[PDB]
Amino acid sequence: GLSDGEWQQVLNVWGKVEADIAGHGQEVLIRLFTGHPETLEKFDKFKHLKTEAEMKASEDLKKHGTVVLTALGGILKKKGHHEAELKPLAQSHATKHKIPIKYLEFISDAIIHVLHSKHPGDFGADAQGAMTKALELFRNDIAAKYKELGFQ
Numbered sequence: 001g002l003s004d005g006e007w008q009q010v011l012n013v014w015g016k017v018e019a020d021i022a023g024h025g026q027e028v029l030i031r032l033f034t035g036h037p038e039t040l041e042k043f044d045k046f047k048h049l050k051t052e053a054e055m056k057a058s059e060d061l062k063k064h065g066t067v068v069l070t071a072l073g074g075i076l077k078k079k080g081h082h083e084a085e086l087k088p089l090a091q092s093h094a095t096k097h098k099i100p101i102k103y104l105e106f107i108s109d110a111i112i113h114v115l116h117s118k119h120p121g122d123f124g125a126d127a128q129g130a131m132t133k134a135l136e137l138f139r140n141d142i143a144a145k146y147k148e149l150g151f152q
């Protein structure tokens, strides 16, 4: 898992996201959708977005971005003791939304990219290392739930 120092780094970085949750959420989803078009097809409510301009102008996409990052933030603040928060998320994404773990890898990478894009020179090597470990823990624990369900 993460050391106490690493968790402190993760939550310090997260402070940046909380200053503009909607903005960060929107950019993460847009990065995901534009870099991996197949992911957009998983959202019946966003598949109508044919261009990045339409994505950028979608208030509902920003709304979902807020929902996504608020959920992730709650999980991160548990510093690994997130079973109750993570299990339901893993089950809904596997059984209901049918999200392959690969897409969770994609969105994890998108978060790292967006942090650098919005905070160039202010997302240090140590910070990236800590956030990466937190996102991997998140992804790996979801993966365990996916295996339980036999979901691919």
Ligand code: HEM
Residues within 6 Å of the ligand: 039, 040, 042, 043, 044, 045, 067, 068, 069, 071, 072, 088, 089, 092, 093, 097, 099, 103, 104, 107
């Ligand atoms: C940072 C990782 C993610 C988090 C924290 C997250 C969180 C959430 C939350 C809180 C909801 C609403 C409640 C629910 O249905 O469980 C949701 C819905 C959904 N998520 Fe995710 N999600 C993540 C990644 C993804 C990825 C990678 C995809 C597919 C590319 C995805 C697709 C969906 C869909 C299709 C819905 C239903 C949307 C609707 O209301 O129509 N999610 N997600």
